Structures are given as structure tokens and as C-alpha cells.
């Protein structure tokens, strides 16, 4: 019954800022709590703070204070979420969510919004083939990219048994390496073409690679 | 604050099995604590509310109880749909908490992985960098231990790993390792291999290449 409908992904650099919103469509926006809450790559959730809009009253947690400031708009029912003096460990999927005071609960969540942190610059991926042997196993590693996603598909996606595309991996660089396989049968390696495609949407990079032995 | 541990930190079962997932506060949160439910890529998704309440349109086979430190949440029989991670949540103190995440995975039969090494293409080394690729292919349980081996010698600091959701067809892990160092470091060396342990494995299995 309520929508909560956050804005796009953000890349920022250390010491900077970022503002998010959530806009609600439907029920009450004035007799609500608005929370936002975060989460690392694979770990776990954390609450940030919140604010009930029509007294314009926000609370934080204390690791967070002075950090985080969390306003609202009842007039566009938007909520918004700003971290100032970013770091590396800021880097997380944001999202917010509805609080209900009666019982202590979030119902309504909203997409969320990922904000990578980094001193990285967006940076297309290079695409390296990685050949089967001489049931066989090929695939592509797509090195050095910046930031997160990136997709991988094979033959146009018309090939989709067998793959596996394994999550990315932060190297020290600061910048992003994945790889993507798939197992065939050795028959077809003689004739079956192979190709990896990789997109790269935050750098409207599109790169394929045939992969042969 | 007030600190949430669930437990096991892992369950495996199979579908149409009982789960039984438990959540321990610190102190007492009375009846004012929530489960979720949460898949890759999606925001959690409210099952139970102060503490044995369901949210509208949650499923008859999710269910919760306790009160005050301790906490249930029971799935009577797991559906396909219910393998993922929850968290328990509470509010009866600022700041608001979560649990660390349960994650319910599907048990199956011990599979052994299918072990593939990858040199570095000439078109990278081109670039002044050598990565070297591990695949681990459908294997259950998920731990493995990859090991890389250089002329022999154990390699350490160097390599970083990857491991794919438990696949729904066949419910088994794959798991990706990259070694890399720099092109002179990689030239002045022959053997590189990758050393795998598993408990589908009777010993170690090593696979290598001579540059």
C-alpha cells in the first residue's frame, strides 16, 4: 500500500558528501517514522537514525552523530538521508524504511541505494580470456573496474547453463575483479564458439571477448 | 546498546523440513523484537513483528515466540522460497539493533569439486600484470580450502576468493581464486599451482601449469 522509492547509486570520493532520498507514494507520510539503515557488502544491517516528519524530530545512533543528518519534506512526502565526511567503510547499500512506533517494527522498506566510497574513479573493466584446458571449463576475467556492477553474460545470454559469475573482489588497487565461467562439453570445443559479454553500466562500457583453447 | 546474537550462524536442511531459528538479547527487549527475511539483492522483507505477531501476507508456515532474552522463530515446513538469511530486530531501546543473520541453506549430498587452473593470457601480461584463476566447481559442503603454490612454496597475502549462492537447481557452491602479482614477479618463476582440500576429497587435489 505505501511505495518507498529511493535515489540512484552515488559514487563519491573520501571526506565528501552524499544525500539520499526516499519518496513515498501512498498511505500517511504524516503519520509515520522514517528510519534509515545501512548494509556493507555481505555483512550485516545497521540503523543509522530516523525522523518522524511532522514534528521534524530526528534521532541518531551515537557511532553516527555529527555524521548523519536525516530531514524530511512533507510537502513531496521525501525523507532524506545526508553522510558527510565520508570514508572507504561507508561504502553500502542504504535503505529506508518505515518505523512503526507501536510495536518497534520496519514494514515499508524502500529499494535501497548503493553509495561506493572510494578514491577510485569510474573506470571500465579490461576482459581477459580464461581458456579451457588441452567436461571442459572456460570463462573470462573481467579485471579492474570501478565501481560496482558489472554483468556478465555468454552468447548473447543465450547461454545460461552451466555459468557460474562469481561475486566481485575489492583488490587494494581500490578497484574491482570478477570472473565469470562456464562448463561445456568437450566435443564442442572444435566448434562451439564461446564469447563472454560484459557490461559495464556505470561506465556505459560493452566489451566481448571470444574465448578459445 | 542493546545486542542481538542469533543462532546457528548456518542451518542445513531439506525442503519440507522444521526450522528452528533462535535470537539472544543482551538484555530484555520484552516483546518488542522483529524477524526479517533477506535475498540477494533485495531489501529485508518483515515476517514477525513484537515478537509473535505476522505481517500482512507472510505465510501460515512462519511463526514466533519468546519474550524478555530469548527468541524463536519456527518455519513449520521450509519451502524452496525460504532458503535465505534472516534477522531478528528489536526497538524496545534506542538505538535500534539487528541480529548478526541466520542463514538456511539446503542440505545435500557431500559433492567433491571439479578443479580447472587458469594462466594468464599474453594479452594481460601485455599490461605488466599476471593473474592466476582457481575454479572450484559444484561442490557441497561450502567450506574448501584453496591453497596456492609457487615452485613449491606456499603462497600467502597474494590471492583473494569469491563464492557463488548455493545454486537452486542442484544446491551445490562454486568458488573462484585469483593469484596476482606483476609481470617480472610472475616470469621469474615456472610451476604455479592450486592446491584444493574438501571433505568430498579423499586427499588434496593440486592442479598447475609451467609458464
Known amino acids: 500500500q505505501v511505495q518507498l522509492v529511493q535515489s540512484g547509486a552515488e559514487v563519491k570520493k573520501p571526506g565528501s558528501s552524499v544525500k539520499v532520498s526516499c519518496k513515498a507514494s501512498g498511505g500517511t507520510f504524516s503519520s509515520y517514522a522514517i528510519s534509515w539503515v545501512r548494509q556493507a557488502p555481505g555483512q550485516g544491517l545497521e540503523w543509522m537514525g530516523g525522523?518522524?516528519?511532522?514534528?521534524?524530530?530526528?534521532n541518531y545512533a551515537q557511532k553516527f552523530q555529527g555524521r548523519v543528518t536525516i530531514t524530511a519534506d512533507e510537502s513531496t512526502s521525501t525523507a532524506y538521508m545526508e553522510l558527510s565526511s565520508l570514508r572507504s567503510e561507508d561504502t553500502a547499500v542504504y535503505y529506508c524504511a518505515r518505523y512503526d512506533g507501536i510495536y518497534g517494527e520496519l514494514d515499508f522498506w524502500g529499494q535501497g541505494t548503493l553509495v561506493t566510497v572510494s578514491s577510485a574513479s569510474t573506470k571500465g573493466p579490461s576482459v581477459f580470456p580464461l581458456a579451457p584446458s588441452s567436461t571442459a571449463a572456460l570463462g573470462c576475467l573481467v579485471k579492474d573496474y570501478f565501481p560496482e556492477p558489472v554483468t556478465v553474460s555468454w552468447n548473447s545470454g543465450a547461454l545460461t547453463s552451466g555459468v557460474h559469475t562469481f561475486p566481485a573482489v575489492l583488490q587494494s588497487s581500490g578497484l574491482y575483479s570478477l570472473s565469470s565461467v562456464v562448463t561445456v562439453p568437450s566435443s564442442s570445443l572444435g566448434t562451439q564458439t564461446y564469447i563472454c559479454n560484459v557490461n559495464h553500466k556505470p561506465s556505459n562500457t560493452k566489451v566481448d571477448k571470444k574465448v578459445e583453447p | 546498546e542493546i545486542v542481538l546474537t542469533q543462532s546457528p550462524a548456518t542451518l542445513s536442511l531439506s525442503p519440507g523440513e522444521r526450522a528452528t531459528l533462535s535470537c539472544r538479547a543482551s538484555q530484555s527487549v520484552s516483546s518488542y523484537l522483529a524477524w526479517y527475511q533477506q535475498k540477494p539483492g533485495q531489501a529485508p522483507r518483515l515476517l514477525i513483528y513484537?515478537?509473535?505477531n505476522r505481517a500482512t501476507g507472510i505465510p501460515a508456515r512462519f511463526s514466533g515466540s519468546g519474550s524478555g532474552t530469548d527468541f524463536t522463530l519456527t518455519i513449520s515446513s521450509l519451502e524452496p522460497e525460504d532458503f535465505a538469511v534472516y534477522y531478528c530486530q528489536q526497538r524496545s531501546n534506542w538505538p535500534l539493533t539487528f541480529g548478526q543473520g541466520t542463514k538456511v541453506e539446503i542440505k545435500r549430498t557431500v559433492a567433491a569439486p571439479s578443479v580447472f587452473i587458469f594462466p594468464p593470457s599474453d594479452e594481460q601480461l601485455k599490461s605488466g600484470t599476471a593473474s592466476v584463476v582457481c575454479l572450484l566447481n559444484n561442490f557441497y559442503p561450502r567450506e574448501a580450502k584453496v591453497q596456492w603454490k609457487v615452485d613449491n612454496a606456499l603462497q600467502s597475502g597474494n590471492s583473494q576468493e569469491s563464492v557463488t549462492e548455493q545454486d537452486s537447481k542442484d544446491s551445490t557452491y562454486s568458488l573462484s581464486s585469483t593469484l596476482t602479482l606483476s609481470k617480472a614477479d610472475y616470469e621469474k618463476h615456472k610451476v604455479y599451482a592450486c592446491e584444493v582440500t574438501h571433505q568430498g576429497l579423499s586427499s588434496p587435489v593440486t592442479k598447475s601449469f609451467n609458464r
Open positions: 525522523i518522524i516528519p511532522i514534528f521534524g524530530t530526528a
Open positions: 513484537d515478537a509473535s
